[PDB]
Amino acid sequence: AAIDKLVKASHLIDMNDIIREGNPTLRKVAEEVTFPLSEKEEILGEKMMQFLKHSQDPIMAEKLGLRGGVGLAAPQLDISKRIIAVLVPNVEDAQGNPPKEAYSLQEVMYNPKVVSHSVQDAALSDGEGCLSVDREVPGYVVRHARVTIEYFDKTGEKHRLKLKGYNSIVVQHEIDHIDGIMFYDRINEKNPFAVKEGLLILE
Ligand SMILES: [Zn+2]
Ligand SMILES: [Zn+2]
Ligand SMILES: [Zn+2]
Ligand SMILES: [Zn+2]
Ligand SMILES: [Zn+2]
Ligand SMILES: [Zn+2]
Ligand SMILES: [Zn+2]
Ligand SMILES: [Zn+2]
Ligand SMILES: [Zn+2]
């Protein structure tokens, strides 16, 4: 089982742990976790966060052969549980000063879901990618501009959070993975770059 390989104390998640487009696990609805968490589930969360951390450190990323990334969902590791990790850094300013907060979003989320959202839609100008998808896929991935989410942390504490902009896009993309939805499911079928009036194009 994947879970045993991934939770071994010395194991670091890398690209070779990521399942590929076509693997049926990517299209399942992932199973809810129960609290208190098993050790495996707690460790998996930690390994997932560490993966993002490693991904974002140019030298660790070079060492492990990782591209930079801000999100990861358990189904991408062949684990059909509702566990996602998100790590969205703030950027340095023009003078090279680090931001006051390292991250605008940093969480391992258990059983996350969208509980409400804006009528307005948004999409990243540059489109979206996927660690599991080894194809070029152009177009606007159309999502909710703003969302309210609930989730539980590793302790079982419930959180409720409003998200907008890029962080909104990120959590939606991850939650989609745990529902068996892929980014290109949300790209217009006739014209990948169609803009419905009022769509927020995010720079
Ligand atoms: Zn591995
Ligand atoms: Zn069940
Ligand atoms: Zn722990
Ligand atoms: Zn490390
Ligand atoms: Zn609620
Ligand atoms: Zn709705
Ligand atoms: Zn993804
Ligand atoms: Zn929705
Ligand atoms: Zn399509």
Curated annotation (Swiss-Prot):
Keyword Thylakoid part of the UniProt annotation: no
Keyword match Iron: yes
Keyword terms: Hydrolase, Iron, Metal-binding, Protein biosynthesis
InterPro entries on file: Peptide_deformylase (IPR023635), Peptide_deformylase_sf (IPR036821)
One family name in Pfam for this protein: Pep_deformylase
Essential cofactor(s): Fe(2+)
CDD domains hit by this protein: Pep_deformylase
Catalysis performed (reactions): N-terminal N-formyl-L-methionyl-[peptide] + H2O = N-terminal L-methionyl-[peptide] + formate
UniProt GO molecular function: metal ion binding; peptide deformylase activity
Cofactor note: Binds 1 Fe(2+) ion.
EC number of this enzyme: 3.5.1.88
One example of a Gene Ontology biological process annotation: translation
Binding site for Fe cation: 130, 173, 177
Active-site feature positions: 174
Enzyme class per UniProt: hydrolase
Record family assignment: Belongs to the polypeptide deformylase family.
Its biological purpose: Removes the formyl group from the N-terminal Met of newly synthesized proteins. Requires at least a dipeptide for an efficient rate of reaction. N-terminal L-methionine is a prerequisite for activity but the enzyme has broad specificity at other positions.
Name of protein: Peptide deformylase
Organism lineage string: Bacteria, Bacillati, Bacillota, Bacilli, Lactobacillales
